[PDB]
Amino acid sequence: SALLAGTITSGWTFGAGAALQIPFAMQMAYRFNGIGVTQNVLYENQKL
Amino acid sequence: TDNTFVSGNCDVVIGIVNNTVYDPLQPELDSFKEELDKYFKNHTSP
Amino acid sequence: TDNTFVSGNCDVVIGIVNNTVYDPLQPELDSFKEELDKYFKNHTSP
Numbered sequence: 001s002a003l004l005a006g007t008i009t010s011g012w013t014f015g016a017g018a019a020l021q022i023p024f025a026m027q028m029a030y031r032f033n034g035i036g037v038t039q040n041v042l043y044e045n046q047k048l
Numbered sequence: 049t050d051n052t053f054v055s056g057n058c059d060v061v062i063g064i065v066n067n068t069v070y071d072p073l074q075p076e077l078d079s080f081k082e083e084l085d086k087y088f089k090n091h092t093s094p
Numbered sequence: 095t096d097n098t099f100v101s102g103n104c105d106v107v108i109g110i111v112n113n114t115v116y117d118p119l120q121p122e123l124d125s126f127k128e129e130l131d132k133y134f135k136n137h138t139s140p
């Protein structure tokens with residue numbers, strides 16, 4: 001629960017130190033940006 | 049605009065807000081407009 | 095400027111050095127100023 005709750009609310013940031021909150025949709029944008037599909041492509045399809 | 053890319057229009061992005069985006073080309077050209085218009089003015093003189 | 099970004103004045107970076115940094119926008123506005131001058135100069139002759 002703590003690993004999962006930490007993840008859905010703070011992304012990777014609790015894995016480095018204190019948790020830093022981030023809006024999920026945006027976070028997923030950083031993810032998409034990490035696999036190189038530029039972050040707009042998430043927000044342009046967030047519902048899908 | 050040197051920090052930012054563009055894609056699509058202000059209907060699709062959930063939670064998008066309103067804010068100016070500054071373009072450093074613009075006042076680099078606006079100082080070129082006032083440099084220009086003062087040469088228009090002095091050329092009317094002679 | 096297309097190759098480089100900026101932060102702060104030079105008082106902070108130990109071992110920093112001085113060199114002229116080229117702006118590839120500038121001679122494109124200088125050439126457009128010499129083109130502009132020509133229009134200003136010709137507009138005197140009629």
Ligand SMILES: *[C@@H]1O[C@H](CO)[C@@H](O[C@@H]2O[C@H](CO)[C@@H](O[C@H]3O[C@H](CO)[C@@H](O)[C@H](O)[C@@H]3O)[C@H](O)[C@H]2NC(C)=O)[C@H](O)[C@H]1NC(C)=O
Binds near residue numbers: 065066
């Ligand atoms: C963010 O800034 C936008 C641009 O100023 C703004 O959009 C404008 O919103 C108003 C109100 O919805 C629209 O007003 C018109 O609405 C209808 C036509 O669609 C007419 O019946 C009205 O008489 C009136 O003319 C503007 O046309 C609209 N402009 C654009 C370009 O979208 C947003 O509302 C702003 N949002 C926030 C959160 O501040």
Ligand SMILES: *[C@@H]1O[C@H](CO)[C@@H](O[C@@H]2O[C@H](CO)[C@@H](O[C@H]3O[C@H](CO)[C@@H](O)[C@H](O)[C@@H]3O)[C@H](O)[C@H]2NC(C)=O)[C@H](O)[C@H]1NC(C)=O
Binds near residue numbers: 111112
């Ligand atoms: C790179 O450029 C720097 C700025 O053009 C330059 O720093 C300047 O160096 C001069 C000469 O040492 C200083 O001249 C003044 O020095 C003291 C005050 O600091 C006064 O007593 C003197 O009378 C004289 O006015 C400038 O003050 C100094 N400018 C700054 C902002 O620190 C560097 O030396 C240059 N470096 C190289 C490698 O070219």
Ligand SMILES: *[C@@H]1O[C@H](CO)[C@@H](O)[C@H](O)[C@H]1NC(C)=O
Binds near residue numbers: 090094
């Ligand atoms: C305008 O042009 C004349 C030359 O025709 C020059 O003497 C004068 O200094 C110029 N003044 C300005 C404000 O550019």
Ligand SMILES: *[C@@H]1O[C@H](CO)[C@@H](O)[C@H](O)[C@H]1NC(C)=O
Binds near residue numbers: 108109
């Ligand atoms: C680099 O080392 C030399 C001594 O070999 C010294 O004079 C110089 O000031 C040093 N440069 C910096 C930026 O510390």
Ligand SMILES: *[C@@H]1O[C@H](CO)[C@@H](O)[C@H](O)[C@H]1NC(C)=O
Binds near residue numbers: 132136
């Ligand atoms: C000068 O301006 C006139 C229009 O007024 C144009 O026909 C002519 O080609 C121009 N000449 C030069 C060298 O700019």
